[PDB]
């Protein structure tokens, strides 16, 4: 399993008038590329007429 989340970022804290603990509004995007290999077996030989 591949777990993804966005690392939270803290809001400003300091001389501003009672900001309080907040979190920066951040969302993540990306391109997830998956490559699967499949072993493949040859078709069985056939001797039918039809």
């Amino acid at each position: 399993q591949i777990f993804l989340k966005i690392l939270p970022q803290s809001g400003p804290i300091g001389g501003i008038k009672s900001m309080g603990i907040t979190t920066l509004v951040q969302y993540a995007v990306g391109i997830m590329t998956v490559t699967m290999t499949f072993k493949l077996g040859p078709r069985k030989a056939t001797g039918r007429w039809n």
């Binding site: 056939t46 001797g47 039918r48 007429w49 039809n50």
Partner: protein
């Protein structure tokens, strides 16, 4: 016998009456795709 094949003609016929020779020999004919491939 080598025979002469030559019918009489005058109903639609060829441009001209045909003629040829028939030989005592037989020959092989396998000019067909389905002879080499089964349906499968």
């Amino acid at each position: 016998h080598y025979k002469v094949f030559s019918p009489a003609a005058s109903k639609v016929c060829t441009i001209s009456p045909i003629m040829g020779y028939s030989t005592p020999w037989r020959y092989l004919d396998f000019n067909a795709l389905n002879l080499f491939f089964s349906p499968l």
